[PDB]
């Protein structure tokens, strides 16, 4: 159905490659040319996952595991039951994600709003892209991508993390994590600020931007403002996604050795009186 | 102030051509001199 | 901006120069980069404050 | 040769000059460094071989 | 005769420049091929 | 890992560092190495070090005999000398008695 | 291209804004000195506001510095007061928790005794800061959401160093005060107790931690997308919604089939952020105390994947082939 | 430990051990601690090859 | 032929800049491809014949 | 069909010409690179074989 | 001869700053790469020449 | 005509000073380059 | 001879600070280069000359 | 005439005169220092 | 002889603060590098002298 | 002429005492280096 104000905004136009052919809504969702490709790619990828689960022998969501081929197969296509299905689902996943981002461009173009959201999603796509197609090419084997399982891809992170000898000392992982913690810290404080101002104790007037602006001025001595928090917060999250891409793209094809041994430059400098 | 005009076009190209010929004249001498020192053909 | 951006550009050029300057006399790329990054923060900030 | 001044009516003289100014130096520097890369036209090591 | 119409001169040049750059980068990665090449040993 | 020039997943699965069913065959070899290093240090290296080594070869803190370990024989490689057959030409060092040149 | 509202193209500065104030009379404990910074103004407010010098804040600052100094001088005493070595090993030195053979009993100063003293002062500073947040919200007649959101972080903070060590039977279960050492503790904690990937509450906390970053990229971009409609003024959009709230809602209604309000977005934003340490605090609290091996817990609960391939490199390649010879 | 070795093998082994350990005059003087350790090291090396 | 009408649809002032950069990338790219191959390293070929 | 001229009544000539112009180029770029990718259809590498 | 018209399109203060930084970086880079070579290294030469 | 707000009357004067400095910069550069030929030739 | 007109282009305060820190950084860099080399490092030379 | 800094030619006459004097004084000390270190340890 | 008018362009309080920081940092840096070498490390020389 | 709101009357006075401080700072540095040179010479 439609919201109480949705009727006016539902106007034709604002499409990239599609026209009025795909310019319609299915329920609340907006279908476009890229919503057509999203539906095809997502359904094909989802079905192939369950087809692989059927051949794997288990339908348990925890135990479903579609894995990339062996490293011996290199960059070529593998047999479907030997890793080839993972490659196709990856191709479907890339198409589904890119089309979803391109559909969001059509959503915001129709609404006259900015393209910040599809750009922000593209950073998260780049983090997935660098994990499944960029890192394997730099290594010359599709088998370095994470398997498509709820817990199997946790084993890949564990094994890849220890494949570089205490991944915690990875400088880009160190930068990426502190962006993840800061974004959650910023999300908690920002969400608290608006809710606290809008929801005072019973019998008290609602607080405007000035009251919430001065709260952190009295709390931490500086308030970034109503507008500032959203742009700094977007950059905090995008940096978290970007530096996550860096920490895994520099793991294998850049620093094959252990990550603590990377810090040998700091420990071994001419300035230090050995 | 945006845009050019025909009157300034003849002089701008002429001085640009003079610079290009001067740059090329040094370049051919540099290329010729390097050939005796060490030919690449 | 303008002056501040240019002053930052001078620092990153100086940081790159110090990165390769220390590599020539020894050190390593990572050791030289830290001095180059440190130089960019120091002289870049000083120039952006004093010149501008 | 001298009748091709009509093209200049399209370009902003500042924009094209700075674009071509950095282009020539980058191209010249790139050509110089690939000459340094090869073992035959690297004039620095040629002097070393000549002077033994 | 001179035509005085509003145009965006550098709009298509940058479009083909990045498109050419992708072709440019691919040619380098095919002719020379993987400068800092690495190999992995599957242990599981 | 540093002594072997390899990583953690060279010997066992990260998700189960304890499970013998999730161990590379190289893990079993490392068990023999741990026993051998303990045997070499406790009965071969230290007893002969405290008897003849001069003070300049002793430790800086405890003045103890130097001990061998994984990197002493591997030197940062998966196998010593990258698996170069070194004892085939030297039957004298292969057995304690009767070199068996054959 | 169209102006993306990432950096302000022009910023104005007027008289410094002190505060709103009420009969709670916050002015006496509020600083009278403020500063302006144009570098930070390109992305946020350019005014360095005045601290409110409350007693909870002062106690937290004083005792927090005491914990910081105590850890610092033990670190300086680690290398024998050698400043160049202290700077070189700054990321490696720490104030290690007491040895496990002491239990809850007070250990000697060189073997974790100063850790307990530093931890006690850190506990006072952290709690006092929370009381500052609660009091500041109370004095501003605002909601206590900041205090409750902070209290969630205290939960994992208390579980990591106070609650779990008390009911684990030893102070040695606390986290060392070091840059790399608490990373070593983080890895060793997962290794000792199986694999925290297979801890469901660790997985749940990861779900909300990714969701927290996901939402605040969604919320940050969506507000910046509707900032051309005054979407940055969220509070006024809550009381009287304009096209900014409607377009932001319809962007996500047309994308993922459902949306939020300008106020309901922060309830979603608040809870995933708050749930990240709450779920993590539960998982750590019952790690070792209840479950001593998480992978084995996964095996018996049938959510640990099984692999049918061989585990040796010899099964996929050979040593000579890997070396290319 | 080396008496039973043949003359050709003893010379072959002694020359290699001196080159392998970097001591040109290894086992020249039995009183030297180099000889005392080397004899035990020979027994150790044989132990590793057959017992391990 | 009758190819002079291509300018009736394409903008001549907009195509030269697109064309001008297009030929630059071709010349730069092809020159580097030749250097990759040992048979067309004219820098290295000057050493083999003069050896 | 001789009545294919009506495609221009549906497609904008300016928009379709730039559409194929890029498309025709990626054709040439892609297929040529695929040839260079293969060892058999790599004329650059073949010339080396005939040289020896 | 008409090279003086270059200042009609370039800001003298903008180009001079660019010229100043470019010349020093070019001079430093040439000096630096010279030190990298063993032959054209006056610091290493003096040590070798002395002994 | 002028594109940076600088009059053509003194535009020639600006280039006259600039070229004099450029020649002076090249004069010492040539002398320095001449000196390093004698010290250590590379041709 | 007419170089005095550069100040009509460069702001004195902005350029004096720029070259004020350029000289010290250049002097420190050149000095630190002499530390890196062994022939012109007066600290080891003093130690060597002191036997 | 032309002045980007709002500084007259007469002022630049004095400003450059002191700067040139500072240039020579800084160079003269450097020249003496360079000659002194060349005697101590020549580098060419 | 006419260097007194440097302050006509340089603010005293603005340059005095920078100069004071620079002088102490330079003095500490020279002291630190002097302690790096074993020949001029007066703390180790005192230890060796009394040994 | 002026950029910091100072005239020749007091700017000359400011430099007069600044040089006095500079000479005093240098004078104690000269004897300090002279004492160090006697103790541990570096030439
Ligand atoms: C032993 C393991 C090592 C380790 C090894 C690794 C490895 C290995 C990796 C990380 C990576 C990461 N690590 Mg680590 N890391 C360790 C310890 C930690 C700790 C901690 C407290 O201890 C933390 C916080 C982190 C944090 C992180 C983040 C920096 C990052 C997570 C991925 C991410 O950013 O998103 C990136 C991923 C995406 C954004 C996914 C994109 C999603 C797509 C576009 C949309 C999905 C749609 C999908 C179809 C769902 C739709 C279905 C329904 C319809 C909705 N690591 C341990 C020590 N870490 C990972 C990384 O960086 O990845 C880039 C990585 O590969
Ligand atoms: C090999 C490493 C182990 C690992 C071991 C652990 C351990 C151990 C823990 C986590 C926990 C976390 N892990 Mg894990 N984890 C691993 C792999 C990962 C990966 C990944 C991609 O691989 C990710 C994304 C995560 C993600 C996470 C987060 C979900 C969670 C912590 C949330 C948090 O910030 O709480 C917020 C709370 C805090 C960080 C402390 C609050 C701080 C207090 C309130 C502030 C005091 C300030 C202080 C005084 C300093 C003030 C100074 C100021 C400058 C003035 N882990 C692997 C399995 N993980 C935590 C958990 O379990 O949660 C259930 C935890 O304890
Ligand atoms: C990338 C930067 C950060 C970010 C941002 C971000 N994500 C976004 C957006 C933004 C700004 C959106 O606008 C978009 C959205 O609409 O969200 C509701 C989205 C989104 N990111 C999502 C999830 C997500 N984000 C994550 C993280 C992050 N979000 C980053 C920290 C994570 C992590 C790391 O845990 C996840 C899982 C979705 C909710 C949504 C993308 C929706 C989408 O792509 O829909 C089309 C596709 C389908 C409906 C199904 C496709 C199925 C495939 C064809 C087959 C399976 C492929 C897959 C790889 C298998 C996985 C197997 C196992 C590993 C589980
Ligand atoms: C909902 C979960 C998220 C969260 C939320 C959260 N954190 C919070 C809050 C909230 C809602 C606050 O209100 C509170 C705050 O005020 O934030 C600005 C805070 C906070 N969480 C913080 C950190 C933090 N949060 C983290 C994470 C998280 N907290 C989660 C992601 C992390 C992690 C896990 O990495 C950290 C490290 C702080 C910024 C702040 C708590 C600070 C506080 O109020 O008291 C702590 C102690 C002090 C202020 C005293 C410190 C001592 C000195 C200031 C340092 C030394 C100074 C100097 C060197 C002295 C030198 C002296 C000598 C020269 C003698
Ligand atoms: C202040 O401002 C703001 C708001 O408030 C104005 C907001 O609200 C939000 C939004 C944020 C919120 C918190 C609101 C509430 C939302 C959430 C809690 C979710 C976000 C948080 C997460 C942790 C992510 C969780 C993920 C969820 C809930 C899943 C959503 C994503 C999906 C990909 C699933 C939905 C997509 C589907 C089903 C497919 C899309 C459909 C199409 C493309 C249609 C294609 C159709 C055809 C081609 C025709 C064929 C038709 C068929 C087959 C018929 C079938 C019909 C169907 C309907 C399937 C933000 C950021 C904001 O800042
Ligand atoms: C090994 O393989 C490699 C080699 C890698 C390879 O294969 C790649 C090789 C590749 C890609 C070669 C491609 C080369 C090309 C394309 C050549 C570019 C060179 C060009 C185009 C020459 C421009 C000359 C411009 C000048 C120099 C003008 C002089 C300007 C003067 C000095 C200015 C005078 C002043 C004015 C005009 C004032 C104007 C103002 C008013 C009138 C007010
Ligand atoms: C890998 O690369 C390797 C192989 C290493 C390599 O060698 C690469 C080298 C390559 C590519 C060479 C590239 C060098 C080039 C291109 C040389 C450019 C250099 C030039 C052009 C010299 C300018 C000199 C300018 C001065 C110095 C003017 C003097 C100015 C005076 C002092 C003051 C002027 C002031 C005024 C006029 C204003 C006052 C007047 C009025 C207000 C009226
Ligand atoms: C790898 O690199 C290796 C090989 C290591 C390397 O070494 C590379 C070396 C390279 C690249 C050399 C680069 C150096 C160059 C180019 C030398 C520039 C240096 C210059 C030019 C010296 C300026 C001196 C300025 C002073 C000192 C003025 C004194 C000013 C005095 C104090 C007067 C101030 C007075 C007033 C303001 C009053 C008037 C005011 C009014 C009338 C108001
Ligand atoms: C890395 O390389 C190695 C080899 C290690 C290295 O060491 C490199 C060393 C290098 C590069 C040396 C760099 C040092 C340089 C360049 C030396 C600058 C130092 C100078 C110049 C000293 C000024 C001292 C002046 C004072 C301190 C005056 C005191 C003033 C007094 C306090 C009076 C103030 C009061 C007034 C003025 C009142 C006026 C008021 C009214 C009239 C109202
Ligand atoms: C110039 O500087 C000088 C001056 C030198 C200086 O100082 C510099 C200081 C320097 C470098 C120190 C820098 C500190 C660093 C890097 C440490 C980072 C710290 C980290 C990562 C913290 C992780 C663990 C945190 C938890 C998780 C705590 C748990 C706390 C618990 C909750 C406390 C519970 C309370 C008790 C156990 C007490 C019980 C007893 C009673 C109640 C009586
Ligand atoms: C940038 C986005 C991704 C674009 C990817 C383009 C690169 C794709 C590489 C495909 C490589 C196919 O090359 C394959 O190599 C393997 C190893 C060979 O296997 C032997 C196959 O015979 C060959 O088909
Ligand atoms: C952050 C962004 C990261 C961007 C990532 C870009 C990844 C680029 C991958 C480059 C590797 C592919 O380029 C590689 O080129 C080599 C060099 O001849 C070619 O061939 C090479 O790989 C193939 C595998 O297919 C082997 O069988 C072959 O023996 C080897 O020579 C292939 O064409 C391709 O494998
Ligand atoms: Fe918000």
Handedness of CA M15, M16, M21, M26 (dihedral sign): positive
**φ and ψ of G98, to 5 deg:** -65, 155
Of the candidates D13, D14, D47, which has its C-beta nearest L42's C-beta? D47
The pairing of beta strand G177-178 with beta strand G94-95: antiparallel
**What is the DSSP code string of A179-243?**
HHHHHHHHHHHHHHHHHHHHS-STTSPPP-HHHHHHHHHHHTS----HHHHHHHHHHHHHHHHHH
Is M17–C14 a contact, with Cβ atoms under 8 angstroms apart? no
The pairing of beta strand A24-26 with beta strand G94-95: unpaired
Do M and N share at least 3 CB pairs under 8 Å?
yes
Q: How many CA atoms lie within 13 A of J35 on its CB side?
A: 12
Quick check: helix, strand or coil at residue A27?
coil
Give how far N18 is from chain O: nearest CA, Å. 6
Burial label, A158 (beta-carbon count in 10 A; 0-12, 13-18, 19+):
buried
In chain J, what's the furthest Cα-to-Cα distance? 59
**φ and ψ of F23, to 5 deg:** -115, 135
Quick check: helix, strand or coil at residue A251?
coil
Residues whose CB falls within 8 Å of the CB of residue G173, separated by 6 or more in sequence, listed in order? G97, G164, G165, G288
Q: What CA–CA distance (Å, rounded) separates D44 from L26? A: 23
Helix (H) or strand (E) holding A29, with range, is: strand A29-31
M3 in L contact zone (CB under 8 Å): yes
Residues whose CB falls within 8 Å of the CB of residue I34, separated by 6 or more in sequence, listed in order? I40, I41, I42, J44
Helices (H) and strands (E) in chain A, counts: 10, 2
- Measured between beta carbons, which residues in chain D are less than 8 angstroms from residue L43? 43, 47
**What is the DSSP code string of G170-194?**
-GGGSPPEETTHHHHHHHHHHHHTS
- Token readout for K36 is 């990298």
Quick check: helix, strand or coil at residue F74?
helix
In chain K, what's the furthest Cα-to-Cα distance? 58
Residues whose CB falls within 8 Å of the CB of residue G150, separated by 6 or more in sequence, listed in order? A188, G129, G130, G133
Mutate which: D22, D29, D43, D44, vs K, most K CBs within 10 A: D44
Q: Do A101 and A121 contact (CB within 8 A), yes or no?
A: yes
Q: What CA–CA distance (Å, rounded) separates G223 from G234? A: 9
Q: Is K46 annotated as contributing to ligand binding? A: no
**Rg of chain E on CA atoms, in Å:** 21
Residues whose CB falls within 8 Å of the CB of residue A52, separated by 6 or more in sequence, listed in order? A64, A66, A81, A85, A86, A89
Q: Do A160 and A98 contact (CB within 8 A), yes or no?
A: no
B40 in I contact zone (CB under 8 Å): yes
Q: Do C11 and C39 contact (CB within 8 A), yes or no?
A: yes
Q: Which chain L residue shows the shortest CA-CA distance from N3?
A: L6
Residue nearest to atom 3 of ligand 6 (CA): I31
- In this structure, the dihedral spanned by the alpha carbons of residues A63, A67, A71 and A72, taken in order and rounded to 10 degrees, is 100
**What is the DSSP code string of L6-21?**
--STTHHHHHHHHHHH
Q: Is F23 annotated as contributing to ligand binding? A: no
Of the candidates I14, I25, I37, which has its C-beta nearest E12's C-beta? I14
Q: Which chain D residue shows the shortest CA-CA distance from E5?
A: D10
Q: Do G192 and G295 contact (CB within 8 A), yes or no?
A: no
Handedness of CA E38, E41, F3, F9 (dihedral sign): positive
Resolution at which this structure was determined, Å: 2.7
Instruction: Write out residues with Cβ below 6 Å of ligand 9.
Output: M 24, 27-28, 31-32; O 26, 30, 33; P 10, 13-14, 17-18, 21-22, 25
Q: Is O39 annotated as contributing to ligand binding? A: no
For chain J, breaks with the C atom over 2.5 A from the next N come after none
Give how far F13 is from chain E: nearest CA, Å. 8
Q: Do A117 and G7 contact (CB within 8 A), yes or no?
A: no
The pairing of beta strand G177-178 with beta strand G47-48: unpaired
Residue entry with tokens 């007893």: F47
Give how far I30 is from chain E: nearest CA, Å. 8
Burial G285-312 (b: 16+ CB within 10 A, else e): bebbeebebbbbbbbeeebbbeeeeebb
Give how far P27 is from chain O: nearest CA, Å. 15
Q: Which of B20, E4, D16 is nearest to I13 (CA)?
A: E4
Beta bridge partners of F23: F12
Beta bridge partners of A26: A29
- Write out G19-74 in H/E/C secondary structure: CCCCCCCCCCCECCCCEECHHHHCCCCCEECCCECCHHHHHHHHHHHHHHHHHHHH
Q: Which of G124, G127, G119 is nearest to G153 (CA)?
A: G127
**φ and ψ of E34, to 5 deg:** 50, 75
Ligand 8 center to residue P30 CA distance, Å?
A: 25
Residues whose CB falls within 8 Å of the CB of residue C30, separated by 6 or more in sequence, listed in order? A262, A265
Residues whose CB falls within 8 Å of the CB of residue G232, separated by 6 or more in sequence, listed in order? A226, A227, A230, G223
Measure the CA angle with vertex G276, ends G204 and G93; round to 5°.
110
Measure the CA angle with vertex A137, ends A67 and F10; round to 5°.
60
Give how far M2 is from chain L: nearest CA, Å. 6
Measure the CA angle with vertex A236, ends A232 and A237; round to 5°.
125
Of the candidates K12, K13, K46, which has its C-beta nearest N43's C-beta? K46
Residue entry with tokens 């002089």: B11
Q: Which atom of ligand 4 is nearest to G133's Cα?
A: 13
Mutate to test the pocket of ligand 11, among A72, A73, A75 (most ligand atoms within 8 A of CB): A75
Of the candidates O3, O11, O40, which has its C-beta nearest P4's C-beta? O11
Burial label, E27 (beta-carbon count in 10 A; 0-12, 13-18, 19+):
buried
Do A and E share at least 3 CB pairs under 8 Å?
yes
**φ and ψ of G194, to 5 deg:** 90, -100
Helix (H) or strand (E) holding N32, with range, is: helix N9-40
Ligand 3 and G256: CB distance under 6 A? yes
Q: What CA–CA distance (Å, rounded) separates G150 from G146? A: 6
Of the candidates J22, J36, J37, which has its C-beta nearest E19's C-beta? J22
Indicate the length of chain N as a whole number.
Answer: 44
Residues whose CB falls within 8 Å of the CB of residue G273, separated by 6 or more in sequence, listed in order? A184, A185, A187, A188, A191, G149, G152, G208, G212
- The set of long-range contacts for G206-211, using a CB threshold of 8 Å and a minimum separation of 24, is G208/G272, G208/G273, G208/G275, G208/G276, G208/G279, G209/A180, G209/A184, G209/G276, G211/G272
Q: Do F22 and A176 contact (CB within 8 A), yes or no?
A: no
Which residues of G touch chain E, with CB atoms under 8 Å apart? 307, 309-313, 316-317, 322
- Measured between beta carbons, which residues in chain K are less than 8 angstroms from residue C10? 21
Is K3–B11 a contact, with Cβ atoms under 8 angstroms apart? no
Q: What CA–CA distance (Å, rounded) separates G242 from G230? A: 8
Beta bridge partners of A30: A25
Q: What CA–CA distance (Å, rounded) separates A274 from A260? A: 19
Ligand 8 and M26: CB distance under 6 A? yes
Q: How was this structure determined?
A: cryo-EM
Indicate the length of chain J as a whole number.
Answer: 52
Q: Which of A61, A55, A71, A264 is nearest to A163 (CA)?
A: A71
Ligand 3 center to residue A40 CA distance, Å?
A: 17
Beta bridge partners of G178: G94
Ligand 1 center to residue A161 CA distance, Å?
A: 11
Distance of alpha carbon G190 from its chain centroid, rounded? 19
Quick check: helix, strand or coil at residue G95?
strand
- Token readout for M18 is 């720029």
Ligand 9 center to residue N21 CA distance, Å?
A: 20
Q: Which atom of ligand 12 is nearest to E32's Cα?
A: 17
- Token readout for F13 is 């699965």
């Amino acid at each position: 159905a439609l919201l109480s104000f949705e009727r006016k905004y539902r106007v034709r136009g604002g499409t990239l490659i599609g026209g009025d052919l795909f310019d319609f809504w299915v329920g609340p969702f907006y279908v476009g040319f890229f919503g057509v490709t999203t539906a095809f790619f997502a359904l094909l990828g989802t079905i192939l996952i369950f087809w692989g689960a059927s051949q794997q022998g288990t339908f348990n969501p925890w135990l479903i595991n579609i894995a990339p081929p062996d490293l011996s197969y290199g960059l070529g296509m593998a047999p479907l039951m030997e890793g080839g299905l993972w490659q196709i689902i990856t191709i479907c996943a890339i198409g589904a994600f890119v089309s979803w981002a391109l559909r969001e461009v059509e959503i915001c173009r129709k609404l006259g709003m900015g393209y910040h959201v599809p750009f922000a999603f593209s950073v998260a796509i780049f983090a997935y892209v660098t994990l499944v197609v960029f890192r394997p090419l730099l290594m010359g084997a599709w088998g370095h991508g994470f398997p498509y399982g709820i817990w199997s891809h946790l084993d890949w992170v564990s094994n890849t993390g220890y494949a570089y000898l205490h991944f915690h000392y990875n400088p880009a992982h160190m930068i990426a994590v502190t962006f993840f913690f800061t974004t959650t810290l910023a999300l908690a404080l920002h969400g608290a600020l608006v809710l606290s101002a809008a929801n005072p104790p019973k019998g008290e007037e609602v607080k405007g931007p000035d009251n919430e602006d001065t709260f952190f001025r009295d709390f931490i001595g500086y308030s970034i403002g109503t507008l500032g928090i959203h742009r700094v917060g977007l950059l905090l999250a995008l940096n978290a996604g970007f530096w996550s891409a860096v920490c895994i793209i520099i793991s294998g094809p850049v620093w094959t050795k252990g990550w603590p041994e990377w810090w040998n430059w700091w420990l071994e400098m001419p300035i230090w009186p050995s | 102030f945006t845009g050019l005009t025909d009157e300034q076009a003849q002089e701008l190209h002429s001085v640009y051509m003079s610079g290009l010929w001067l740059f090329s004249a040094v370049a051919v001498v540099a290329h010729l001199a390097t050939f005796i020192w060490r030919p690449w053909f | 901006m303008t002056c501040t951006i240019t002053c930052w550009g001078i620092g990153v050029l100086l940081g790159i120069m110090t990165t390769v300057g220390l590599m020539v006399v020894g050190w390593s790329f990572l050791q030289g980069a830290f001095m180059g990054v440190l130089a960019w923060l120091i002289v870049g900030g000083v120039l952006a404050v004093a010149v501008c | 040769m001298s009748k091709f001044y009509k093209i200049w009516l399209i370009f902003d003289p500042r924009r094209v000059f700075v674009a071509q100014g950095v282009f020539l130096f980058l191209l010249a520097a790139m050509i110089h460094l690939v000459l340094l890369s090869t073992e035959h036209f690297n004039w620095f090591e040629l002097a070393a071989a000549n002077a033994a | 005769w001179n035509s005085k119409n509003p145009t965006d001169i550098y709009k298509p040049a940058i479009v083909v420049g990045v498109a050419g750059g992708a072709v440019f980068a691919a040619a380098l990665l095919v002719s020379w091929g993987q400068p800092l090449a690495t190999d992995s040993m599957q242990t599981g | 890992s540093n002594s072997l020039g390899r990583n953690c997943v060279f010997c066992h699965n990260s998700r189960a560092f304890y499970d013998p069913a999730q161990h590379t065959p190289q893990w079993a070899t490392a068990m023999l190495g741990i026993s051998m290093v303990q045997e070499l240090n406790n009965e071969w290296i230290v007893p002969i070090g405290e008897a003849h080594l001069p003070p300049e070869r002793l430790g800086p803190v405890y003045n103890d005999v130097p001990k061998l370990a994984c990197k002493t024989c591997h030197k940062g490689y998966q196998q010593p000398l990258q698996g170069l057959n070194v004892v085939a030409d030297w039957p004298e060092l292969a057995t304690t008695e009767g070199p068996f040149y054959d | 291209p169209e102006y993306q509202n990432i950096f302000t193209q022009v910023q104005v500065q007027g008289p410094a804004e002190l505060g709103v104030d009420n009969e709670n009379n916050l002015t006496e404990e509020r600083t009278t000195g403020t500063g302006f910074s144009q570098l930070i103004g390109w992305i946020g407010n350019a005014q360095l506001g005045p601290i409110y010098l409350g007693w909870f804040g002062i106690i937290s600052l004083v005792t927090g510095t005491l914990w910081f100094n105590i850890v610092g001088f033990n670190m300086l005493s680690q290398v024998g007061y050698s400043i160049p070595e202290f700077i070189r090993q700054l990321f490696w030195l720490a104030l290690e928790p007491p040895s496990p053979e002491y239990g809850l009993r007070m250990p000697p100063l060189d073997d974790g005794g100063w850790f307990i003293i530093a931890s006690f002062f850190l506990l006072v500073s952290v709690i006092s800061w929370w009381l500052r947040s609660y009091q500041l919200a109370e004095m501003h007649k605002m909601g206590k959401h900041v205090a409750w959101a902070f209290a969630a972080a205290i939960w994992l903070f208390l579980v990591l160093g106070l609650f779990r060590p008390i009911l684990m039977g030893s102070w040695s279960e606390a986290v060392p005060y070091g840059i790399f050492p608490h990373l070593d503790w983080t890895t060793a904690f997962s290794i000792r107790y199986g694999n925290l990937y297979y801890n469901p509450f660790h997985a749940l906390s990861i779900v909300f931690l990714y969701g927290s970053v996901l939402l605040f990229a969604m919320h940050g971009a969506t507000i910046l997308a509707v900032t051309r409609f005054g979407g940055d003024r969220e509070l006024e959009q809550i009381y009287d919604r304009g096209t900014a709230s409607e377009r932001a809602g319809l962007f996500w209604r047309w994308t993922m089939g459902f949306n939020a309000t300008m106020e309901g977005i922060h309830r979603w934003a608040w809870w995933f952020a708050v749930l990240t340490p709450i779920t993590g605090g539960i998982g750590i609290l019952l790690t070792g105390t209840v479950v001593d091996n998480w992978f084995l817990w996964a095996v018996e609960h049938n959510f640990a994947p099984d692999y049918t391939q061989d585990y040796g490199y010899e099964a996929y390649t050979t040593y000579d082939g890997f070396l290319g010879r | 430990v080396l008496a039973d070795l043949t003359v050709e093998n003893y010379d072959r082994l002694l020359a290699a051990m001196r080159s392998w350990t970097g001591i040109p005059d290894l086992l020249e003087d039995p009183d030297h601690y180099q000889s005392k350790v080397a004899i035990n090291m020979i027994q150790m090396n044989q132990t590793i090859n057959e017992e391990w």
